[PDB]
Ligand binder design. Structure first.
Ligand SMILES: Nc1ncnc2c1ncn2[C@@H]1O[C@H](COP(=O)(O)OP(=O)(O)O)[C@@H](O)[C@H]1O
Ligand SMILES: Nc1ncnc2c1ncn2[C@@H]1O[C@H](COP(=O)(O)OP(=O)(O)O)[C@@H](O)[C@H]1O
Lengths: 128, 41, 371, 374
């Protein structure tokens, strides 16, 4: 088990760190990029994972970037209404030839870090 | 024909020693960033 | 800019940047699709689940493997793994970086040509290269001469390397995978009274095999001790909360590696395959080959495999010969590490397949550019 | 030795069959159920009967709850199995168990404790001089009379495919599927709800089984038959309940057995029986496959649906390469075939060497069964 212990230590040290500084850098960079465009409608985000759960912030970001006007989000605070808002945002992204896989409403709502970061990166890279 | 004619195995050994030294030190360093994201900062 | 190293064996995918010690992303190579009808209006719409996100919701998916025995059976799925690797995990632009890919020794040429065509046409990579895994294992090990046996989920292969040269004579490719061991483990767990049929239950059986297995030094005393007493018994908790006891089978599933007669195959064991690959080489180089045996791959992570391999090779080898078995504690990722080293050499930058060279030569450039 | 004939007992999940060696047909065939009363008992002087087993458990099923001792080929309750064996030996055949040896059949892939407990029960209580345990699908090939072939046995508990070439069986190509007529009866009971008929008790399950055995068939083309059933009413048939009520099964007749070929109707992820047979064929070596293509043998009571052979042949032909010739061998006596094979195995002069003696059991405990048999 000593060999397995050394291997497990390698897993929980090296790969953890080599990911972890990368997403904590990219989170700040993406937050700055989104907040710069979102200043025109006078809306700020202070944490990337919490603010994208409602789906209205992503709708406003696509509102600023796209140039035309998206459908209304549902005026409700339930989980299913958040799923509606995120699904509407993903539908609008799908209509503009943007390729997304392993992307769903429940993934954004539940707060998966790497999938939210991948969605933001795809919007940055392909839409602008 | 695959390997270049003039090369050093000691170069490969020194290179893997340089990588393993950084593994031992465990210095934190982020990955490369795109130039498009370099523009926004 | 630093290149990308993408190790793609069957079952798991590893990805990272060049010049780094460890890969950034490690995730299984599974693509699942929902089989049950959805009745709740307003949920998320997902046609396919890729990678680790697929393995969380195993209860409503039919798991499938795009790579079988080192061969990509489904290319549309392989595109999904590659795209999820590039955009969701690494979140890097594919056209900004060159990429490095790994494969088994003996494969059809159509696999190499299709990887080159997909890697150039779809992702618009500026450069790419295809490297053999087992040679990269020796770069990770740190010796210019030795024989390496890479056994992973999908494939097992032995190659000897002398002075950085890969001898095509003694390359042996055995189709004794860890997935075959998982299927044998299911078949022998049927005897105790436990039945696993679905692919999610196959993943549970794989977790059982990884957590609770070992290789005995001698099989007969282990069987006699298992029959005599109940000291060699362990318990495992299923995801539904049911406790199962394995007992005898813990040293029976990996023993199929050394004796393939349990699985019904005709090929010899891994020790005999390594010995035969050693015998195929020249007489005067057998010294370094016997003294520098290297183990690699996730299949060789069972406890006690190194001592058993040393004993089995020593029995076959001449008595005057020194036998040494090298097993690094981090050998499972060693292949990727070798690739990173090969990606960071100054003289390797001359070896990249440029985009315009591919435009001139077609997909057949890969055969003349890389080994 | 000459006049003494070993008893042959076929023991499936649904029904139990028993007879003497050297006979073409079993003497006693009866369902394997054990029923117990549930209501009040108010008439004094009628006598006390704690348990009902066998055919006369079926006759008084109105006031009984019915339990199956064998589920999916596994003996869950052993006391009821002892009841069934005692009723077989004494009431049905009227033979002393000490006089003759006993031959038993079982599924290929079963837990070890089932075999050990079978050996322990047949030596310790019934006191038999010898006993042997064999596989049902192997005995089906004995009944067929050919050296080579692939046997697909489908009973009430389990379906299994074994290939045999030149008297040699391949253990790695043996396939087991937990999809039998038991689940088909449950599926028919589920799909009869949408026409307004409700069967819930264990007594009504026998009525549903009778409806399945009388008014079911396998369509050669599923979609065309569904279109025909939607277009016209010529496919409808009428059945009479024991209380005189009349029901019309209609569309369901070809939908209940269709779950054999498409298990997704039951929520199962497994493949169909045709795909299971094809996969069992391709798990063997290259050379024998042609012979395994030419001698596919059907067996068991589940394969008694009309039109099963044509659909199976069509599906296998679609899966197999076109240059091979595919035929399906289904004798009219395929419900009893296993038992016939047992008798053929029990009367051989060579097989007298292979009996498990009582002295060997006394020396080796119940673990002797794995070393012998198969
Ligand atoms: N800790 C462990 N102990 C024993 N076996 C393991 C362990 N981890 C993984 N394996 C086996 O190794 C296989 C993974 O091999 P891997 O090195 O990922 O192959 P590749 O990288 O070529 O895809 C798994 O299928 C599993 O059966
Ligand atoms: N004539 C028939 N037509 C269609 N199906 C039948 C017929 N007779 C029996 N069956 C099915 O077969 C089952 C009985 O199978 P059986 O031969 O008793 O299996 P085993 O003997 O292996 O237990 C019944 O439950 C029923 O579903």
């Amino acid at each position: 088990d000593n060999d397995n212990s050394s291997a497990r230590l390698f897993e929980r040290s090296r790969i953890k760190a080599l990911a972890d500084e990368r997403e904590v850098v990219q989170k700040k960079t993406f937050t700055k990029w989104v907040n710069s465009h979102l200043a025109r409608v006078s809306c700020r985000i202070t944490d990337l994972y919490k603010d994208l759960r409602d789906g209205r912030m992503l709708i406003k970001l696509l509102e600023v970037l796209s140039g035309e006007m998206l459908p209304k989000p549902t005026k409700g605070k339930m989980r299913i209404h958040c799923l509606e808002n995120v699904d509407k945002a993903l539908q609008f992204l799908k209509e503009q030839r943007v390729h997304l896989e392993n992307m769903g409403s429940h993934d954004i709502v539940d707060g998966n870090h790497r999938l939210v970061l991948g969605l933001i990166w795809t919007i940055i890279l392909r839409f602008q | 024909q695959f390997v270049p004619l003039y090369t050093d195995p000691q170069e490969v050994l020194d290179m893997r020693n340089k990588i393993r030294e950084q593994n031992r030190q465990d210095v934190k360093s982020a990955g490369p960033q795109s130039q498009l994201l370099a523009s926004v900062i | 800019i630093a290149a990308l190293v993408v190790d793609n064996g069957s079952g798991m995918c590893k990805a990272g940047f060049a010049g780094d010690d460890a890969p950034r992303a490690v995730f299984p190579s599974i693509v699942g699709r929902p089989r049950h009808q959805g009745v709740m209006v307003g949920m998320g719409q997902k046609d396919s689940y890729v990678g680790d996100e697929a393995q969380s919701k195993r209860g409503i998916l039919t798991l499938k493997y795009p790579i079988e025995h080192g061969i990509v059976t489904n290319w549309d799925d392989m595109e999904k793994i590659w795209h999820h690797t590039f955009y969701n995990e690494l979140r890097v632009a594919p056209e900004e970086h060159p990429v490095l890919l790994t494969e088994a020794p003996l494969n059809p040429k159509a696999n190499r040509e299709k990887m080159t065509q997909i890697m150039f046409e779809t992702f618009n990579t500026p450069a790419m290269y295809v490297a053999i895994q087992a040679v990269l294992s020796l770069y990770a090990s740190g010796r210019t001469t030795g024989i390496v046996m890479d056994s992973g989920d999908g494939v097992t292969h032995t190659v000897p390397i002398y002075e950085g040269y890969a001898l095509p004579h003694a390359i042996l490719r055995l189709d004794l995978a860890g997935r075959d061991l998982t299927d044998y483990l299911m078949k022998i767990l049927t005897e105790r009274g436990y039945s696993f049929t679905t692919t999610a239950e196959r993943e549970i059986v794989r977790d059982i095999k990884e957590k609770l297995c070992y290789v005995a030094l001698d099989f007969e005393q282990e069987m006699a001790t298992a029959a005599s007493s109940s000291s060699l018994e362990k318990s495992y908790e299923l995801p539904d909360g049911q406790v199962i006891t394995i007992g005898n089978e813990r040293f029976r599933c990996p023993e199929a590696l050394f004796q393939p007669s349990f699985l019904g195959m005709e090929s010899c064991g891994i020790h005999e395959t390594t010995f035969n690959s050693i015998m195929k080489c020249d007489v005067d180089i057998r010294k370094d080959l016997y003294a520098n045996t290297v183990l690699s791959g996730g299949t060789t992570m069972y406890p006690g495999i190194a001592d058993r391999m040393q004993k089995e090779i020593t029995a076959l080898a001449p008595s005057t010969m020194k036998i040494k078995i090298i097993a690094p504690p981090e050998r499972k990722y060693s292949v990727w590490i070798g690739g990173s080293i090969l990606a960071s050499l100054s003289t390797f930058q001359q070896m990249w397949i440029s985009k315009q060279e591919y435009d001139e030569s077609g997909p057949s450039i890969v055969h003349r550019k890389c080994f």
